Write a protein that binds this ligand. Structure first.
Ligand SMILES: *[C@@H]1O[C@H](CO)[C@@H](O)[C@H](O)[C@H]1NC(C)=O
Ligand SMILES: *[C@@H]1O[C@H](CO)[C@@H](O)[C@H](O)[C@H]1NC(C)=O
Ligand SMILES: *[C@@H]1O[C@H](CO)[C@@H](O)[C@H](O)[C@H]1NC(C)=O
Ligand SMILES: *[C@@H]1O[C@H](CO)[C@@H](O)[C@H](O)[C@H]1NC(C)=O
Ligand SMILES: *[C@@H]1O[C@H](CO)[C@@H](O)[C@H](O)[C@H]1NC(C)=O
Ligand SMILES: *[C@@H]1O[C@H](CO)[C@@H](O)[C@H](O)[C@H]1NC(C)=O
Ligand SMILES: [Zn+2]
Ligand SMILES: [Zn+2]
Ligand SMILES: [Zn+2]
Ligand SMILES: [Zn+2]
Ligand SMILES: [Zn+2]
Ligand SMILES: [Zn+2]
Lengths: 445, 445, 445
C-alpha cells in the first residue's frame, strides 16, 4: 500500500513500513512428462549430408537419454534437499512398477490430465514434448531399412528444433545434480507456467498475484528430475504456495552510532543488529537475515520461510523503546568510527565521523545538505545521490512519506571508560547489567 | 559403507560416521587441441542467401579466433591461480617455439596420442574438432575464386554444427579469463571424459569411481586456455587425482546449547565450533569448513584438500571427552537463546528455547514428538518434517542407525554470573581458566 | 610498473607495491535499439514444413516481445539499484511521449547517431538489429495473404539467425529483472563495444586501456532494459568511466602471528585486519575489502569505488610503525594457533605452529626450505609450491623484487596472562590502553 519510513535519531536506524508480504508456506508439485522413443542405434547405407545430419542429431538424442540415466543411478546430494522433500516424494512414486504406466495412459490424448498416484497425491501431469511421435513417424520409416532413405532438409531442421528442448533440459539437470533453481523456460515455458498457475487450488486473487510475478515464482521454485522408464521422461516442478498474503512487512536499516569526540581512541560506537525483513506471520514475526530470501516488487515482498527466524511480536517495540528489558533489543559495540551510508527505501542514513566529507547532492542544484559528525538522515524528495568520502551512492526514487523521529543518541548515555567495546550479539539490558557489575568493581576500590 | 549417527546430549552435537572419502591430492593434465584453418577474409561476387549465410558463419569463426587471441595478449588473473599451477605450466611449454609443431605431428592421423613435451611431462593430447579439414575441403574451393560458388544448404547447416563448439568454448573462456570451472561438456564431452579417465595412471578400482561420478569430477576440474599458434587451438583440462580413497569421513553437526531459565537475560548459551567434514588424511585429520568443498554421493564424499585444515587426530575425542585440555575443543558463547534446528544425515537436532513451538511430525500420523526447552534429537525413522516456529525443515530419508548418547548438558556446569558470554573461537580449557581467574578476583574481595 | 613486495617479520604481513590502479568514478550510458515489427498473429492455409517453421519461429518472436512487455509492467527491484541510477534515469526519459520518436528518426539511415534527449543528456544511440526490415520485406508479403506463400529454406534459416539475438537478450533480461551484469556479447558485441569505446569523451591513453581490457570493462558494466514502444526495443548499457588512472595501488596480505610456547593453551595470537587493495584516491586511500571488487591484469588493477572505504593516507604507515596512536592500526586477537599460508604476489607468508609440517619445495630440487614455529616468508624465485600440513599451495611466478624487513615479532611484547584474546576489530593503541587498565587492577591488589 503506502510505503512510509521512520528514522530514529536515537538509535541511528530506519524502518520502512507499508509493504505487503507473500510468505511461502507450502509447495504445489506437478509432473512434467516428455514422450520419448525407445530406439537403438541402426546403421544403413548413408552418404548424402542429410542422412549424416539426421544420424548426428539422433546421437545427441541418444547421449542425452543415457546421460539422464547415469544421473539417476548415482545422484549427488544437494543443499536443497531440506526444501524438496515434497517433490522428491513424487519421484519415488513414479519409480514404482506400474505407476509410470498410469500417467502414460492419462496423457494418451491430451497434453494435461489429473492423475491420482499411489501415494494419495492428486497431481496434475503435463506432456510438454512428444519425441516418440516425431521419431516413429518421420525418422524410423526412413532409417529402419537396409539402406537409409533420403530425408528432406525440412526434416533435419524440424528435428533439431524439437530435440533442442531435450538437450537443454539434460544440460541443466546434469550440472545441478537433478535439482535446478530457478526453473527456466526450458523446464517450463511461460505459457505452460501460466496455465499451471491457473489450475492451482488457490484463490482468484492469488492466481492474479503469481501471474503478474512469474519471474519471482520461478526464482522460488524447484525442478526435480525423476526417472526415465518405458519411453517416458518425467520430472517434477515444485511451485510455491503463499499461505500468507498481504501481511505487513517492514525492513529495518541500521547504521553505526558513534560519539563525536575530537581525539581518536576516545570514541565508542554502537549499532543495532539483526537488520533485514520482518513480517507478521501466525502470531509471531518472521525475520529474514539473508538478503536474497526476500524478492521485492516495489509495492510487495515475496519471502521464503525456509530461511527465516521466528521472533515474538514485541521485537517491533525496539524501534520506539529500545531500553526495555521485556524484548531482547540486540546491538553490537566497537570503537571503529568509520563513515558509511545506507540507502533506505525512501532516503539514506549517513554516519559521518572524523575528517570524512559526507554530503547529499541534487543533479541540478548541487550540494543541498552537508552532514556533520554523527548519524543523520535525508529524504529522497529532492535528493539524487549521497557521497561519503570517495564513495557515491544512488538514492531510491520511490514515492513515500518519511518521518524524522528526533531523539538523543543513546550512545551519549554511556561512560566511555567502562564501556564494553567488543560485544557482538548482545542485548541492551545485557550490556547495562555488565556495566553495573563493572562499576561495582570500581566502587569498592 | 554403513552410515551411522551419534547425538551427544551433553554437547548438543551429532557426528555422522561411515562415509568413504576421496580426497584430491594431485592433478592430471591433458591437452585438448582443435585443428583450425589459417584463412583471411575473401570477397567475391555473392548474392544468393547461401553465400551470405556461409560468409556470416565464417565471420563468427573469424571473430572467435581473434577473441581468443586478444585474451592471451592480456589475461586477467583469477582466484584459481593457486590451484592451476600444474596446468598453467603446460600452457607455457606450448608457447615455446617448436612445441606446437610436435603435437601437430603426433595428431596427424589419430584423435588421441601421447606427447612428450620439452618439460618432462608425458601428456595425452586429444584432437576433438577438425575445422581445417572442413574449411579447406568444403569452403575454400567454394570461396577462393573470382566469384563465389554456390554452396548447398546442407553445407551451411553442416558448418554451423561444427563451428558451434568453437563459439561456445570461446564464450566460456572469455567470461572466465581463460580458466573455467566446472568443465562443461563443450570443453570435454562425456564420451571424451570417460576415454580420458580410462587412460589415466590410476587403479582399475579408481577408474570405476571417477566413471560413476563424472559430474563430481567435472565440478572438481579446471579448463585452462593455452595458445593459438600455427593453425592449432590448444587448451589444458586439469583433472583431479584422488590419492586418498576409502578414507573414513565424519560430518560434525552443532546446535546451540542454552540453559532453560524462565527469565530472559538470565540464560547463557554454548555451541561447539568448526562444524563440517572431517576425514583421516596422512596420519592427521583434514577438516573442511566450507560447505561446497566436499561433494557427497550418498554413500561417499569427494573433498578437495586445497581448502582444508590439518588437525591432529585427537580432535575426534572432543565428541566423547570435551573437557580434556589435551585437545583444543573449541566453542562459542553468547546469551542469545533463539530456537533453531539442524537437519543431520539420519535425523535432526532441535534447540528449543522460549515460547517457540518446536515439533516433529509424520505426514500421515501428525505430531509424533513435541520438544521441550533445551537441546534434543530425533531419528529419521518415522519422521518426515521438523517444525521450529514458523519454519518447517525436511528430514533426510537416508537409511542408517542413530545412537542417542545421553548425558548432562555441559552448560549446567557453569555459574551464570561470571560466564564469558562473548567468546568466539575459544577452547574449553581456555574458558575455564578465564573463569578460574575471574573467580579469584571475587575471592579476594 | 615494477611489482615489488615487502614482508614485515614484526607484524607477519606483506605489502605488494608497484600496481597501477584504474578506479571507476563515473558512468557513460548509451542507448541500444532494436528495430522491431509491430505485427499480430495471422493464420493462412499452411501445410508444407517451411510454412510451419516460419510460423514457429515467428511465435518465438511474438512471445519474446510480450515477455519483455510484462517485465516492464512489474519489474522486481535489484541489489544494483544503488549503482544504476545513471542508466535508469535514461530509461525514464524514453518512456516519455515523443522521445522514442526522436531516436527513431535519428537512426533512420545509419546504425549510430548522437541524440539529445529531453533531460540534457547527449547520448549515443546504436541500432544493432533490424527485425522490422526483415519481417516486413521477407515475411509479411509471404504470410499476409489468404493462403500462405511458400518460403524457401534459406529464409527459414536466415530468420533464425536474426531472431536468435532477440531471444537471448530476452532470456538475460528476464532472469535478471532487466538489469544484467556483466554485459554479454549478446547485449553488446565486441565489435560494437570497441566502437563504443572509441566514441567516448575520454583521452586517447584511456581508450587504449579499455580496448585492451574489454572483458574487465564488461564485468564492470551494466545492461538496463528500458521500454518497448512504437516498434522500437531500447535498453541502456552503462559503461565505466575511470577518472583515476595510473594511481599507486598496494595489496596488504596478513597472516596470524602467534607465540611459540610448547604447551597449547599458553600461546596468544595476533593478526592485522583490513586486508585487501589500497589505492591513493583524491588525497585519501580507497580500501577495498571485498575480493571481487578489484580486477587485476597483472601489471594493473581495476577497482570500483562503489564498494570501497575512504581512509586517511596515514593508514599506510601501519606497515612501518604499527604502535603509533596517530593511525588506527587495527588487529584481531585469539588463542588459536593453527598453521596456514598466504600466497602473495611475489611469494608466500607461512604461519607454522604446533606439529604441522610446513615446507616450500621446488619441482626439480625438492624441499628447499623447512619453516620452523612462527611466521616466515619465502620468495617466488626458485619456489614452485608451498605445503602446510596436508595442503599444497601454488606460488605465483610473477617477476619482481621481494624485500624481507627483519624485526622482532610484536606478539613477544605482550604478557600472556593479561592479554585480551577475544578482540575483533580493535586498534593497537586501543588494546594497549585496555592492558594498562587491567594491570592497574592487579597493581592495587
Ligand atoms: C495512501 O495515501 C493516500 C494519500 O496520498 C491516501 O488517500 C490513502 O488512503 C492511503 N492508503 C492507505 C491504505 O491508507
Ligand atoms: C552399403 O551397404 C553394402 C551392404 O549392403 C556395403 O557392402 C557397402 O560397403 C555400403 N556402402 C558404404 C559403406 O559406403
Ligand atoms: C552394515 O550393516 C549390516 C547389517 O544390516 C551388516 O551385515 C554389515 O556387515 C555392515 N557393514 C559393515 C562394513 O560393517
Ligand atoms: C561482381 O563483381 C564485379 C567485378 O568482377 C563487380 O563489377 C560487380 O559490381 C559485382 N557485383 C556486385 C557487387 O553485386
Ligand atoms: C623497473 O626496474 C628496472 C630494473 O630492472 C629499472 O630499469 C626501471 O627503471 C624500473 N622502473 C621504474 C618505473 O622505476
Ligand atoms: C484452407 O483454407 C480454407 C478456407 O480458405 C479452409 O476451408 C481449409 O480447411 C483450409 N485447409 C486446411 C485447414 O487444411
Ligand atoms: Zn503419444
Ligand atoms: Zn538495508
Ligand atoms: Zn588434419
Ligand atoms: Zn550440518
Ligand atoms: Zn529501418
Ligand atoms: Zn591476499
Amino acid at each position: 500500500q503506502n510505503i512510509t519510513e521512520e528514522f530514529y535519531q536515537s538509535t541511528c536506524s530506519a524502518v520502512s513500513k507499508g509493504y505487503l508480504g507473500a510468505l511461502r508456506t507450502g509447495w504445489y508439485t506437478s509432473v512434467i512428462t516428455i514422450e520419448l522413443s525407445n530406439i537403438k542405434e541402426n546403421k544403413c547405407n548413408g552418404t548424402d549430408a542429410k542422412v549424416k545430419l539426421i544420424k548426428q542429431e539422433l546421437d545427441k538424442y541418444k547421449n542425452a537419454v543415457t546421460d539422464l540415466q547415469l544421473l539417476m543411478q548415482s545422484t549427488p546430494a544437494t543443499g536443497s534437499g531440506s526444501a524438496i522433500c515434497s517433490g522428491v516424494a513424487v519421484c519415488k512414486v513414479l519409480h514404482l512398477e506400474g505407476e509410470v504406466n498410469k500417467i502414460k495412459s492419462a496423457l494418451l490424448s491430451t497434453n494435461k490430465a489429473v492423475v491420482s498416484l499411489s501415494n494419495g497425491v492428486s497431481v496434475l501431469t503435463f506432456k510438454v514434448l512428444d519425441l516418440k511421435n516425431y521419431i516413429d513417424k518421420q525418422l524410423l520409416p526412413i532409417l529402419n531399412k537396409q539402406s537409409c532413405s533420403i530425408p528432406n532438409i525440412e526434416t533435419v531442421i524440424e528435428f533439431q528444433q524439437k530435440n533442442n528442448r531435450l538437450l537443454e533440459i539434460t544440460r541443466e539437470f546434469s550440472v545441478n545434480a537433478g535439482v535446478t533453481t530457478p526453473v527456466s523456460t526450458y523446464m517450463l515455458t511461460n505459457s505452460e507456467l501460466l496455465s499451471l498457475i491457473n489450475d492451482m487450488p488457490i484463490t482468484n486473487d492469488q492466481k492474479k498475484l503469481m501471474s503478474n510475478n512469474v519471474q519471482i515464482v520461478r526464482q522460488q521454485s524447484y525442478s526435480i528430475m525423476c526417472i526415465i522408464k518405458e519411453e517416458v521422461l518425467a520430472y517434477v516442478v515444485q511451485l510455491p504456495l503463499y499461505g500468507v498474503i498481504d501481511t505487513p512487512c517492514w525492513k529495518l536499516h541500521t547504521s553505526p552510532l558513534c560519539t563525536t569526540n575530537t581525539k581518536e581512541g576516545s570514541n565508542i560506537c554502537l549499532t543495532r543488529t539483526d537488520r533485514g525483513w520482518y513480517c507478521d506471520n501466525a502470531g509471531s514475526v518472521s525475520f529474514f537475515p539473508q538478503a536474497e530470501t526476500c524478492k521485492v516488487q516495489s509495492n510487495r515482498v515475496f519471502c521464503d520461510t525456509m530461511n527465516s527466524r521466528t521472533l515474538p511480536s514485541e521485537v517491533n517495540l525496539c524501534n520506539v523503546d529500545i531500553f526495555n528489558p521485556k524484548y531482547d533489543c540486540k546491538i553490537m559495540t566497537s570503537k571503529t568510527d568509520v563513515s558509511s551510508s545506507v540507502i533506505t527505501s525512501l532516503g539514506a542514513i549517513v554516519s559521518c565521523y572524523g575528517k570524512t566529507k559526507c554530503t547529499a547532492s541534487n543533479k541540478n542544484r548541487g550540494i543541498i545538505k552537508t552532514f556533520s559528525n554523527g548519524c543523520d538522515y535525508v529524504s529522497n524528495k529532492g535528493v539524487d545521490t549521497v557521497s561519503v568520502g570517495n564513495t557515491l551512492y544512488c538514492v531510491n526514487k520511490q514515492e513515500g512519506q518519511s518521518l524524522y523521529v528526533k531523539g538523543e543518541p543513546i550512545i551519549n548515555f554511556y561512560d566511555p571508560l567502562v564501556f564494553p567495546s567488543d560485544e557482538f550479539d548482545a542485548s541492551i539490558s545485557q550490556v547495562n547489567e555488565k556495566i553495573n557489575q563493572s562499576l561495582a568493581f570500581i566502587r569498592k576500590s
